[PDB]
C-alpha cells in the first residue's frame, strides 16, 4: 500500500485526512506537496508509530535543516526498517548533514538514499561520509547530484567505496569534481570490494584522460550495468580509450549514456565495433554529438548486422538530415531488437519522415516508441504517418511535438488514430500552434478512443 502524491498543494483539511495514512502505508511519497517545517511534527509522529514503513520520499519540499531533522527523528526508533529515503531538493545544508549522518548509523536496513539538489558542500559530504563508514550502515545506492561538491569530496567518497562491499550505485553527476576528482573516485572503485552496478558522472568535468581509468573499471567490474557520462568533454579520443574495456568479454554493460561528449563520426566508428560485439548493450545515447549523416550511416549499418541487440537509441540533436532516413528506414524494417528511436531535433524534414514511415510500415517492424519532435515535420508527412499508424502494429508512442502541423495534417492523423485498427496509445503534440478546429477534432478523439492519450 502507498500514499503517493506529487505536485499538489495540500490544504489543512486534506492534510488532516491524509495523516493517518502516514502511520499505515509502507510507502510514503509526498513529492513537491508544499510541505514545510510547520508540518514536520505530524510526519515525524506518524512515522514513529508506522509498523511497516519501507520507503519515505519527501523530495522537493522546502523543509530546511530544522524540518529535515524533525522528520529524521521519526526514523530514530529500534523497529524502523526503512529501505529507501529521498530528501532530494529539501533545502538541506552541509550543517544539516550531522543528524542525517547520525541516523544512518542505526538503520542497517537503508539501501537507498537520495540527497540530490541540496547544497551540501564538501563539509556536509564529509560529515555524511562519517556515517556511511559506520559498520552498521549498509547503504547500496547513493545519489548526490547538484550538491556543490568539489574534487575534495572524492577522497571521502573513495574511502566509503573501499570499505563498503555492498555498494551498487554512486551518482555524483552535476558536481565540479573535475579530472582530479574523477581520478580519485575511479581509483577508489578499483580498490573497492564492491560489485558496482551503476556509475553516473554526467557534467562532472570528466576528460579524455579520465577515460583510460574508466576503461579499466568497465573491463573489470563484471557487475557494471549502467555508465552515464553525458555532458563531459570525452571527444573521440575518450571513446577510443573506453572501447577496449567495453569490448572485454566479461563486460555486460547494459546502458551507455554519452550524450554531448564531443564525439564525431570517428568516435562513432569505434563505438560501432562495440555494438557489433556486445549483445548485452541495450541502451545507448549519443544525443547532442555532432555525428552527422556519416555517423548515422555507421550506426545503421551496425544495426543491420547480427549481434547488435540495442533496444533503445537516443540520437536527438546529432545533425542528421533527410539523407540518413533511407538508412534508418532499412533498420526499422529489418531490425527486430530496436524498440525506441529518439531522433528528435534533427532536420529530417518531411522527405526524411516519409522515408522512415516506409520502413516502419512493414509487417515485421517492432519499434514501439518513436520521437520526431522538432524535426521540421509539416502536414506533408501526415498522410504517410497516418498510413504507417494503421499498417504497423508495434508502435505505442509517437512524439510529434514542436512541429508545424495544421488543420489538414491533424485531420489526416485523426482519421487513422481514431480507427480500431490503430494500436497507438500515446500521441504527443506539445508546443504546436492550435486552431479551434484542430483542438476540437482531437478533443473528441480522446473520448471516441479511450485507449488513446493525446498529449497537450
Amino acid at each position: 500500500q502507498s500514499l503517493d502524491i506529487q505536485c499538489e498543494e495540500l490544504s489543512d483539511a486534506r492534510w488532516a485526512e491524509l495523516l493517518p495514512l502516514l502511520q499505515q502505508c509502507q510507502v510514503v511519497r509526498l513529492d513537491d506537496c508544499g510541505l514545510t517545517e510547520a508540518r514536520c511534527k505530524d510526519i515525524s509522529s506518524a512515522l514513529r508509530v508506522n509498523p511497516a514503513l519501507a520507503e519515505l520520499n519527501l523530495r522537493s519540499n522546502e523543509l530546511g535543516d530544522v524540518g529535515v531533522h524533525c522528520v529524521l527523528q521519526g526514523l530514530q526508533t529500534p523497529s524502523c526498517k526503512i529501505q529507501k529515503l529521498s530528501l532530494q531538493n529539501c533545502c538541506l545544508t552541509g550543517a544539516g548533514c550531522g543528524v542525517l549522518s547520525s541516523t544512518l548509523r542505526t538503520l542497517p536496513t537503508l539501501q537507498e538514499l537520495h540527497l540530490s539538489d541540496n547544497l551540501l558542500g564538501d563539509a556536509g559530504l564529509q560529515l555524511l561520509c562519517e556515517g556511511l563508514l559506520d559498520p552498521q550502515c549498509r547503504l547500496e545506492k547513493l545519489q548526490l547530484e547538484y550538491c556543490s561538491l568539489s574534487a575534495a569530496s572524492c577522497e571521502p567518497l573513495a574511502s566509503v567505496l573501499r570499505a563498503k562491499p555492498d555498494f551498487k550505485e554512486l551518482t555524483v553527476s552535476n558536481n565540479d569534481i573535475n579530472e582530479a576528482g574523477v581520478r580519485v573516485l575511479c581509483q577508489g572503485l578499483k580498490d573497492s570490494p564492491c560489485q558496482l552496478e551503476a556509475l553516473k558522472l554526467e557534467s562532472c568535468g570528466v576528460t579524455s584522460d579520465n577515460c583510460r581509468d574508466l576503461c579499466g573499471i568497465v573491463a573489470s567490474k563484471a557487475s557494471l550495468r549502467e555508465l552515464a557520462l553525458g555532458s563531459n568533454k570525452l571527444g573521440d579520443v575518450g571513446m577510443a580509450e573506453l572501447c577496449p574495456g567495453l569490448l572485454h568479454p566479461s563486460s555486460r554493460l547494459r546502458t551507455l549514456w554519452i550524450w554531448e561528449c564531443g564525439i564525431t563520426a570517428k568516435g562513432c566508428g569505434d563505438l560501432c565495433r562495440v555494438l557489433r560485439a556486445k549483445e548485452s548493450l541495450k541502451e545507448l545515447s549519443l544525443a547532442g554529438n555532432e555525428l552527422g549523416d556519416e555517423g548515422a550511416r555507421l550506426l545503421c549499418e551496425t544495426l543491420l548486422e547480427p549481434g547488435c541487440q540495442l533496444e533503445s537509441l537516443w540520437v536527438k540533436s546529432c545533425s542528421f538530415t533527410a539523407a540518413c532516413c533511407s538508412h534508418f528506414s532499412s533498420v526499422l524494417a529489418q531490425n527486430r531488437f530496436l524498440l525506441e528511436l529518439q531522433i528528435s531535433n534533427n532536420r529530417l524534414e518531411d522527405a526524411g519522415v516519409r522515408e522512415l514511415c516506409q520502413g516502419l510500415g512493414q509487417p515485421g517492424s517492432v519499434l514501439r516508441v518513436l520521437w520526431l519532435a522538432d524535426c521540421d515535420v509539416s502536414d506533408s508527412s501526415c498522410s504517410s504517418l497516418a498510413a504507417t499508424l494503421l499498417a504497423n502494429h508495434s508502435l505505442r508512442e509517437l512524439d510529434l511535438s514542436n512541429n508545424c502541423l495544421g488543420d489538414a495534417g491533424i485531420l489526416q492523423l485523426v482519421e487513422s488514430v481514431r480507427q480500431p485498427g490503430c494500436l497507438l496509445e500515446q500521441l504527443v503534440l506539445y508546443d504546436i500552434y492550435w486552431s479551434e478546429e484542430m483542438e476540437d477534432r482531437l478533443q473528441a478523439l480522446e473520448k471516441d478512443k479511450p485507449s488513446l492519450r493525446v498529449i497537450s
Binding site: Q6, R59, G230, D374, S401, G406, W434, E446
Partner: protein, 135 residues
C-alpha cells in the same frame, strides 16, 4: 491534452514563464505531471507574463514557421532563458525524467491571440499562446 483548467494563455504561462525550481529536472516535474509524459524539450523565459504581453504589442510579423499566420511578434530583444533538454526518459514515472539545462540570452518570437473572453483577465486583450522560436 491541455489541462481543462487552463486557457491557452495560462498553459503557455505554466510551461514557459513560471519556473518553480532552479533545476530543470525539478521544474519540469509540475509540467510533465499534468499528462504524465515528459516533454522532449521546454524553454523557460526568465521574464514575466506581463512582459511577454508587452511583446505581443510589438508590430505583427509573418510567423517564420507558417507564412499563413501573421500573429507573431519579435521580442524587443534578447531575454534571459533556460532551455530544458530531456536526456534520460522514465516512462514508468515522469518524476524520474532527467533534463540538461542550458542558460542563455536570446531573442524570441511569440504568437499571440485574443484572450479568452470568459476566462482570461480583461487587462490583457491580446495574449501569448505559442513560442514560435528562440534565436
Amino acid at each position: 491534452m491541455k489541462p481543462p483548467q487552463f486557457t491557452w494563455a495560462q498553459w503557455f504561462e505554466t510551461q514557459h514563464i513560471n519556473m518553480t525550481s532552479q533545476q530543470c529536472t525539478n521544474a519540469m516535474q509540475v509540467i510533465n505531471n499534468y499528462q504524465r509524459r515528459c516533454k522532449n524539450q521546454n524553454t523557460f523565459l526568465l521574464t514575466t507574463f506581463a512582459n511577454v504581453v508587452n511583446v505581443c504589442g510589438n508590430p505583427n510579423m509573418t510567423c517564420p514557421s507558417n507564412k499563413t499566420r501573421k500573429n507573431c511578434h519579435h521580442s524587443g530583444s534578447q531575454v534571459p532563458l533556460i532551455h530544458c533538454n530531456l536526456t534520460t526518459p522514465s516512462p514508468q514515472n515522469i518524476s524520474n525524467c532527467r533534463y540538461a539545462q542550458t542558460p542563455a540570452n536570446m531573442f524570441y518570437i511569440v504568437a499571440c491571440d485574443n484572450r479568452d473572453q470568459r476566462r482570461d483577465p480583461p487587462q490583457y486583450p491580446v495574449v501569448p499562446v505559442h513560442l514560435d522560436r528562440i534565436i
